[PDB]
Amino acid sequence: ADVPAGVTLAEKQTLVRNNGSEVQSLDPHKIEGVPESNISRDLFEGLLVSDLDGHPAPGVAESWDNKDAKVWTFHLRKDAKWSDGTPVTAQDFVYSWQRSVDPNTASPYASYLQYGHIAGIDEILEGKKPITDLGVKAIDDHTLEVTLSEPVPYFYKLLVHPSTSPVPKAAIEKFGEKWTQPGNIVTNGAYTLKDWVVNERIVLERSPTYWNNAKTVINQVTYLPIASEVTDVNRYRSGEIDMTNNSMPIELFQKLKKEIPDEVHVDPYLCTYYYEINNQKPPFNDVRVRTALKLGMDRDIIVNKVKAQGNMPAYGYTPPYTDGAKLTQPEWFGWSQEKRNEEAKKLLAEAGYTADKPLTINLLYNTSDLHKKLAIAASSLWKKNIGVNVKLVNQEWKTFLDTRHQGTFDVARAGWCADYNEPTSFLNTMLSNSSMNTAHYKSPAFDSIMAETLKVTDEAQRTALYTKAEQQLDKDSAIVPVYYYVNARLVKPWVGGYTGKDPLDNTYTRNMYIVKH
Template sequence: MTLKTSLLALSLATLPALPAYAAVVPEGTQLADIQQLVRGNGSEPASLDPHKVEGVPEANVLRDLFEALVNSGPNGEVVPGVAERWETDDNLVYLFHLRKNARWSNGDAVTAADFEYAFKRAVDPNTASPYSWYLEKATIVNATEVVNGDKPASELGVKALDEHTLQITLASPVPYFVSMLSHTSTYPVHRATVEKYGDEWTRVGNMVSNGAYQLKNWVVNERIELKRNPHYWNNNATVVEEVTFLPIASQNAEMNRFLSGELDMTYEIPLEHFKRLQASQPDAIRVGGYVGTYYYVFNTQKPPFDDARVRNALSYAIDRDIIAHKVMGQGEIPAYTLAPEVVDGFTPPALGWAGWSQQQRDEKARELIEAAGYGKNKPLRFELLYNTNDNHRKVAVAIASMWKKHLGVEVELVNQEWKTYLDTKTQGNFDVARAGWIADYNEASSMLDLMQSGHGNNDGKYSSPAFDKLMSASRLATDESARNDLYAQAEEILAVDMPIAPVYQYVKARLVQPTVGGYPDNPLDNLYSKDMYIKAK
């Protein structure tokens, strides 16, 4: 039984204190005099408030600034964070025992009351958290009622029993509950700071955080600089002194800055240079499995995308082999389901259309689009939204060409900067949009929950009572095999309704300087700068 499995098993009893992961420098390693890590981060973060974010660029920075009850280890396993141990007798009531030496960056003690305040803030409708659904999904008592405004946040099943003991009560057992608690929506926030500064609490000079680093400088659209937090409980094991995040949307610009030595690691790699870089920079290329799927989401509330025939036609006409192997070409796998093959314990169902040849899919797509009233003599016209990014544009151009060739569809490509794109998608002001989802924990529900009616990130507003019923049943299934069977049935419903068109299963490919030590191949890409170090050249 792996550490991860033992932590989440239903027979979970009192756990001893476990070692927290930190920078482990092999004996004999010569460290660089300057311990500064510069990371490409793709886009400018929409916010640095843990309870008001939903994207990867934000999570990358927040993971350094804040620390949850637990962290994600180098292999995606659960490791202690602020909680040094936890226990439960019935998988409903959990007690988390906090470290007595945990401190905020201003020196204040991190207490159970800080977590109680943060959890209740995350579900409070006044916070308008895009991830409030996450605590509902965890079945924390009264989470749904609080999110819906039927009960006050004070009724949430999270309670500080004393300064160092936090009690969380669930309405029903969730086998993977502890692994959910490394997510940004569960980060603590410093109540006095939030209440003093309001929406400006995340500004430089105002922010108080409890992670290995604290906010030093933030120049919007240019850089975010963090410096070591001397009050962090495990500061002695931290090696990197400063971390800089650069929001570089262009993969080519990011690559050039890496090659010139300005960056220690990139966010992504430009597709057209991948093979060349494999040959010229073999020690810098890092490619690993990634629990996530790239897909296109249809606005099911907007004609003609309220017609499953149109959605299926567009999905069938995407040649996923070309996208995964030719357009991307970094190890991506064609996707026919939302949950990828790399998800721990899950085997995607064998879907009929996934076994067809591309010619068969194209023929069926033409039949469906014509049945819906469209074709080359009456072309379907719509906008395809994606966030500004060279790789997203390449995928969009290729898929639009496939749709034009086989279905006569005329697509207008619309790109928007990250924050605007998120707002547009959330408000439903789109026809078809590029999307992607990276699991918050390594379990199929972290992907499939997305398609539930009323889910905060169900931007296409898909709704299926049959799908919802299966997902509700999965939360009560304590047997892993039975639970994964329910997930497979849910995928089969999505394959018929096609609210999204899965395109490919992600891999995480980036450039990392050989001088960076401690870089893990985390399947969730949860990277903590505190775990890394810079070697002398």
């Protein structure tokens, strides 16, 4: 923590946070989701961490460098330690990354390091080659070299993810699935595990062996598993909880913002809500049709009326607060909605759709109260604004996904959330060849712009190329952007060190402190 000049710290440095649900695992290679990731960041530390602005900063690695973005060397601090006092070494990371990708581990995030194209990983993931073929090696006890099969300039940024944290081989081998129990677990983060009471609480204690412990302020943090969002708020109001989980209904959000607005933190998050157009099915292979749909949607109504949760109207795919993004708002976004509607209907007229002979589209969405509500709202705006008729169509997750990959739809409710804070986390899903491209968008120009982002060495040039990529997407109207996500939580005014500037909400108890109150 960096306690600002002049702040007086409370005598009692303890914190109670609601974590939203019972975490199932504390093992970094078994976790999935936010609740497990929150606790993981307190217990285990990777080569890099996210600073208060969400930018990469030194973790176990004090520095790093690279040759052509293909061979990366991490210089581990020599005083990094586990909770049993033993050194964190480069071999810990070799063991851990091999375990991460091993199909025997069945990690929910097994494929996460494939974003980095570590040599050998594709076949290792499929179980066709041994984990010891992975291009990670310990040059000595404090030096890790990672070899990639192609250039990845942003490789270092991936290494804040909890699935890239080290784990202790000796504990795992001695205890198996019981290695994370309070008596057995060995950790290298700012905190250790004290108590784990199922359905009650997880209690972590400040770890004296942590290399940066002199800068840690909170001595104990408790994580609670309250799934009821209103209950979480009630217990916050009663003084038991210092920080709620980052979720609440809209009507309670509205009331809280009126009574304690500074305590309701509404923070941008790297997900985009959009309608995915199937670009390969007629008439949606017609850019004029796609453009009409894009312009006809009224984002302001969706965001201020049908939501009112402080979600921000979207003009593109990559959120503009993505680190590495400097996005231009397209001209159409600064028009009035009527002007958008007019220009839209004009486009539809050219494509042969006028008031006598209008377009009908089917809108696919996965069964959900939010998605149903938005889809009814979407249908109504397109009908009224641009004369387009919409037939709602709903399916169950597995079928909804399969349908999208098969291309048996017109337009689909969609959301994408970034796995890491860099524009490629969104943009690579629109490459023609991407297995994630359910828009079925195929633009040689787009792919060409993106290919070049891996060749440039200058960050400013890369950023300019990502902007060009978004501009190409928008010119082709690949999708209908609706909004960029926010997450809301309550934080007591005496809880310091929570800025909300990290759009992946990768926070750490070691950054926080209790102000005297």
